[PDB]
Write a structure and sequence with these properties.
DNA damage, five-stranded antiparallel beta sheet, Transferase(Phosphotransferase), domain 1, alpha+beta, three-stranded antiparallel beta sheet, 10 helices, binds the ligand COc1ccc2sc3c(c2c1)NC[C@@H](CN)NC3=O, 2 domains, CDK, protein serine kinase activity
Length: 284
Amino acid sequence: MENFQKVEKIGEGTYGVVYKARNKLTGEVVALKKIRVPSTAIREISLLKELNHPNIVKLLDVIHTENKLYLVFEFLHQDLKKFMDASALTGIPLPLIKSYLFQLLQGLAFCHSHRVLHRDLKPQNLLINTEGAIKLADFGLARAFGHEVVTLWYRAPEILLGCKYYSTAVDIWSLGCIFAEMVTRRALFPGDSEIDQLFRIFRTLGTPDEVVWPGVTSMPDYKPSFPKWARQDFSKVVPPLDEDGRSLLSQMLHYDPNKRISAKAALAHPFFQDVTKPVPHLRL
Ligand SMILES: COc1ccc2sc3c(c2c1)NC[C@@H](CN)NC3=O
């Protein structure tokens, strides 16, 4: 830690505080996350250091000293949340939306192929650079460790319904929600409690039943007393988006996690037929 000089606080992660810092040896500028240690943690983390991909924020180093764990990450200058807030008036152009969606699907396909799930995808966890890249951040830290409130907006329905042994499908759901948000400039399911989140999902996609999601009625927190809402049109949900886009989104938002499209399959979707890599307008 003496080898690092803090520059500024750039966030309060879920696990601790995050600083922009400079490495006194390498001269490197990095994102330092101070985690306030179980052996089980150390080893799962050391596994993440090897999960290297262009669309995954690189874990540079893991420093364990004095009952503190420090995670040293690659630094990027902006997150999708800020970029979305900044692009609110005209919206992110569709080609850049497609590019970002495509890259994140690549990152997920990679993680998922190695049986690693993100668990907590959200705009604040997706970092961008001037080159038009977008990267998954805080990847794998959820399985590692377990005042600000945790956002539920991107949580898959199987997690909300109490499934303990959920799959890579949860990340696809979250990315579907982010996709919709880029397109419409409004969060898709902005719930403020677990039941509000679930009921917001139900009101748009219809209350799930055994027809569309076999086994749903036996989930830990399923209640027969859930109100029954009918499903709405995707044409109403993400209007501007073309049919290829709406088709892909619908498959990312399937209720049944086993019907939900995989990241690999999604990369082959016709939506990506004309994908390109534009450069964003970023003010840093
Ligand atoms: C700036 O480049 C980075 C790189 C890695 C990481 S990790 C992390 C970051 C962050 C930012 N930002 C604060 C929040 C976002 N969820 N929590 C975190 O743990």
